[PDB]
């Protein structure tokens, strides 16, 4: 018995299968994430994305920036995370602008892991990428807002 | 010195005399038994051949396998005939394999 096998029995594709890339727990997990929910509206997935990442990007700008000890300005450093959200969503927008055109199908793969046809993932559109952009951005700014809302003392403010 | 040379050839087998300080090719050029050459510089395999007896000086020979000089093949145009030799001509491809 051996644990590593070529990807789907094809030993001439440039990859392998491991307990890291093809494992039931990892497969199910990575499947149930927004980026891998193919049959779902781009905007909902983007919403999840922006929520989680604004909330996460709150902490570091607060606890490490130049005014970390000045607290007449320490907590309101969420301005910075809002600005970072704005900047990388501008970047999302220009990436989608350059990578796609509406009058062209979505470049995603049409086959699945076993050899059945799928309806190409629409996130790789121009339309749906702009939709996902709006979703991520909405979520990012309001997630910044949410994690700034919880200023109540917990364990480490 | 000027040992006698023997060359099997599709034309037959002929002998010519020629000093040891010379290359075989110009010496078959002297008496006039035509042989195939391209380079005259020891950097191709048109003048290739193998030996029946004796052995030929291959000091100034190059572009050869680290074996082509230990199992028979020789380039006629950069070769000094140290002995009364007996050699082959038109031997490029069974050398080319």
């Amino acid at each position: 018995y051996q644990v590593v096998q070529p990807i789907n029995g094809d030993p001439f594709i440039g990859s392998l299968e491991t307990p890291v890339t093809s494992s039931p727990l990892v497969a199910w997990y990575l499947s149930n994430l927004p980026g891998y929910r193919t049959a779902v509206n781009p905007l909902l997935r983007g919403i999840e994305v922006g929520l989680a990442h604004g909330f996460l990007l709150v902490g570091p700008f607060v606890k490490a920036g130049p005014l970390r000890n000045t607290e007449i300005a320490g907590q309101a450093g969420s301005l910075a995370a809002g600005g970072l959200v704005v900047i990388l969503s501008i970047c999302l927008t220009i990436y989608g602008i350059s990578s796609f055109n509406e009058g062209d199908p979505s470049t995603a793969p049409s086959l699945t892991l076993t050899g059945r046809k799928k309806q190409p993932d629409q996130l790789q559109t121009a339309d749906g990428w702009a939709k996902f952009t709006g979703g991520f951005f909405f979520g990012g700014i309001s997630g910044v807002i949410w994690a700034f809302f919880l200023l109540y003392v917990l364990d480490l403010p | 010195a000027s040992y006698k040379v023997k060359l099997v050839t599709p034309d037959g087998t002929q002998e010519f005399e020629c000093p040891s300080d010379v290359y075989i090719l110009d010496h078959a050029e002297e008496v006039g038994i035509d042989l195939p050459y391209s380079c005259r510089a020891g950097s191709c395999s048109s003048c290739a051949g193998k030996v029946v007896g004796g052995e030929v000086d291959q000091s100034d020979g190059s572009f050869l396998d680290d074996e082509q000089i230990e199992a028979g093949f020789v380039l006629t145009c950069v070769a000094y005939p140290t002995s009364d030799v007996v050699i082959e001509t038109h031997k490029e491809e069974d050398l080319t394999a």
């Binding site: 018995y1 051996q2 644990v3 590593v4 440039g14 392998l16 130049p66 | 000091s59 100034d60």
Partner: protein
């Protein structure tokens, strides 16, 4: 099957005819020169044995006798050291007062005013102060007169002639055959139990009978001439029993198993000798006894001729699992047919060992009066770090040579090698990533610190005063090493070293031998810099080894050899794809890493370890202790280390340290001279040589061996050689002048 001696008689005949025909070994060189390139090739391929021929027997015979030649050379160098200690030295006066006389075993002739280099080293003597630490070894050996040094010089000369004769003999008269060399089990059994076991047993013997009593007498205060000769201690034993009562029972315990009764001179103390600043000799003798026992037992593992033992093939074949397929099956066939695989493993291990030796010898000083001799300590640490780095890089060179010339899955297939070859892409990807991440988070902190210190924002720095990064695990481990003696080591009294802690400080002659070394934010930063440099060097060398045969860019690279310039300017340009070029690039990065290591050690020791102590007990360090607060920015390294400590070497003109001032500048020159070879290419040079040759032809003075420009690979090699020489020699002069001047 069985093990025996196997030899041929008179394989090659002693003659001079091959000396007069240069390049006899290679058919291409033998033909003779047309151009000057010949002369270079003649030297570059001189010791490439497995390229002169195809036969493994011949390569092994050549290797064996070449090893004998190297040993003869080493013996001659030892003979010189002992003769110079005996004849042109102040060793006896230093033996009389070690903490005032600075050692010196080289004098110069008065030829052009150079006698100024014969400086006042104390003791009625004028010469060059040496830093190899030989006086400390000779004192730890028991040597007390120059007659013993003469005797050892003569013995070493004899041994050198013997080695040279054996080198001639095993190549020309009695040359062993391949089956003799290819017996690795008997070889390992002999080197483990015979060379290392019997060696350290014999040495433990010498320490028990000579070094221990003579050093006891010397530390008691006795005049080094009124001490008995060593052999007296062997003839009359009451002399020994006066210093160690246990020598009265005399081997009755060793049999009665009451080894306790030897606790006289076989101890387990730990810590330093507070009289000489070195390890207890009664600890070193006991150590060597234990090591000899361990090795003598370990040299009885492998089966040779009597059934009992272990077959290496069996051990390797037994190990395999579900992640590695069949692994270790097929490594015995490989490790017995290629010299390059063996050389790579051996070089890797010996380089790592040398680095470990550097650390352990600074931290637990073995010789007496070495810890307070600061120049010798600096010299030894630095020397051994450089040697270790070089050997580790050679390991990569010969792994690459094995991959290009010897690896062959058609006749010698191993699974593990094949699997690593089959995921090299992921390997190199992850290593690349971790080096980038490690470089951002260590050097980046320095850049942040410099910018915060220049912007008048020191409260935003990464330091002990503003934002602390304490190495908790290192502090935790040395705290565990402090509490060890008595809790997890009930048999020890003091702990292994004084750097662990416990508040114990050792002084000698008003100087500091050792004390606890403090770890802080600066130590954290420096260590992550070190991890960064080692990871980068590894990336370069391992990329060179793993892709030595083929790539996505050049799919038949193994057919171009191990050392080739390129595969042309196409495909975008393919300069330096060979594995030789990867070794060439890794040498620069090894230089970088080792240089930073020796700078970190040199500044840290002066700042928090070395110095002078007062009778009241207030330690004044050589530098003021400024490593904790100035090492955290780059400006502090440029200002407080380089600029401030180069003063000694830029002010030595007119003194006896002026040779260091001359070598400083010469080394800068050689370094800058290499950049010309590194930054240019040979096309320009050959075209310039064209016109110079014209000028010579104009006067019927042109040479017949046509001058050429150097090879592409030779250009790279000359460049890296002069770069390394220049840089290392600059640091050599700086260190030696600085450390000798202050003390």
């Amino acid at each position: 099957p069985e093990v025996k001696i196997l030899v041929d008689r008179d394989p090659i005949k002693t003659s001079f005819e091959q000396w007069a025909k240069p390049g006899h070994f290679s058919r291409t060189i033998a033909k003779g020169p047309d151009t000057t390139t010949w002369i270079w090739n003649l030297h570059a391929d001189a010791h490439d044995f497995d390229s002169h021929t195809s036969d493994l027997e011949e390569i092994s015979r050549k290797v064996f006798s070449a090893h004998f030649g190297q040993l003869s050379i080493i013996f001659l160098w030892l003979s010189g050291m002992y003769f110079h200690g005996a004849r042109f030295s102040n060793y006896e006066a230093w033996l009389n007062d070690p903490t005032h006389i600075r050692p010196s075993a080289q004098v110069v002739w008065p030829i052009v005013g150079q006698e100024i280099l014969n400086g006042d080293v104390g003791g009625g003597f004028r010469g060059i102060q040496i830093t190899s630490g030989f006086f400390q070894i000779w004192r730890a050996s028991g040597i007390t007169s120059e007659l013993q040094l003469y005797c050892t010089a003569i013995g070493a000369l004899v041994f050198a002639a013997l080695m040279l004769f054996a080198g001639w003999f095993h190549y020309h008269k009695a040359a062993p055959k391949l089956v003799w060399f290819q017996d690795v089990e008997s070889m390992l059994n002999h080197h483990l139990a015979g060379l290392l076991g019997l060696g350290s047993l014999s040495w433990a013997g010498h320490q028990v009978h000579v070094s221990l009593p003579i050093n006891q007498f010397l530390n008691a205060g006795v005049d080094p001439k009124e001490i008995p000769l060593p052999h007296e201690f062997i003839l009359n034993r009451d002399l020994l029993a006066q210093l160690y009562p246990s020598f009265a029972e005399g081997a009755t315990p060793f049999f009665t198993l009451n080894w306790s009764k030897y606790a006289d001179f076989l101890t387990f103390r730990g810590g330093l000798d507070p009289l000489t600043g070195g390890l207890w000799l009664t600890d070193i003798a006991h150590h060597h006894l234990a090591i000899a026992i361990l090795f003598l037992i370990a040299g009885h593992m492998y089966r040779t001729n009597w059934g009992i033992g272990h077959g290496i093939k069996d051990i390797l074949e037994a190990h395999k699992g579900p992640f590695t397929g069949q692994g270790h099956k097929g490594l015995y066939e490989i490790l017995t047919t290629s010299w390059h695989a063996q050389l790579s493993i051996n070089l890797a291990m010996l380089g790592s060992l040398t680095i470990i030796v550097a650390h352990h010898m600074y931290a637990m000083p073995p010789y007496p009066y070495l810890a307070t001799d600061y120049g010798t300590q600096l010299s030894l640490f630095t020397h051994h770090m450089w040697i270790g780095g070089f050997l580790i890089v050679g390991a990569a060179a010969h792994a690459a040579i094995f991959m290009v010339r010897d690896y062959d899955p058609t006749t010698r297939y191993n699974d593990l090698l094949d699997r690593v070859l089959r995921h090299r892409d992921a390997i190199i990807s992850h290593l690349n990533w971790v080096c980038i991440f490690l470089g951002f988070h260590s050097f980046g902190l320095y850049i942040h610190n410099d910018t915060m210190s220049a912007l008048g924002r020191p409260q935003d720095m990464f330091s002990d005063t503003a934002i602390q990064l304490q190495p908790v695990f290192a502090q935790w481990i040395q705290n565990t090493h402090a509490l060890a003696p008595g809790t997890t080591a009930p048999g020890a009294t003091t702990s292994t070293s004084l750097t662990w802690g416990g508040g114990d400080l050792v002084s000698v002659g008003g100087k500091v031998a050792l004390l606890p070394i403090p770890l802080g934010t600066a130590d954290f930063l420096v260590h992550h810099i070190h991890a960064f440099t080692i990871h980068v060097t590894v990336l370069i060398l391992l990329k060179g080894v793993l892709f030595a045969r083929s790539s996505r860019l050049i799919p038949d690279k193994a057919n171009l050899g191990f050392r080739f310039p390129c595969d042309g300017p196409g495909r975008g340009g393919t300069c330096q794809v060979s594995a030789w070029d990867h070794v060439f690039l890794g040498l620069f990065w090894m230089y970088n890493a080792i240089s930073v290591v020796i700078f970190h050690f040199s500044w840290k020791m002066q700042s928090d370890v070395w110095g002078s102590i007062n009778d009241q007990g207030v330690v004044t360090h050589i530098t003021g202790g400024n490593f904790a607060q100035s090492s955290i920015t780059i400006n502090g390294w440029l200002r407080d280390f380089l600029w401030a400590q180069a003063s000694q070497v830029i002010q030595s003109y007119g003194s006896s340290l002026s040779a260091y001032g001359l070598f400083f500048l010469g080394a800068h020159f050689v370094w800058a001279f290499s950049l010309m070879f590194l930054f240019s290419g040979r096309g320009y040079w050959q075209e310039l040589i064209e016109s110079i040759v014209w000028a010579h032809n104009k006067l019927k003075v042109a040479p017949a061996t046509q001058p050429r420009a150097l090879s592409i690979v030779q250009g790279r090699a000359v460049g890296v050689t002069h770069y390394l020489l220049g840089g290392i020699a600059t640091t050599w002069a700086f260190f030696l002048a600085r450390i000798i001047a202050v003390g």
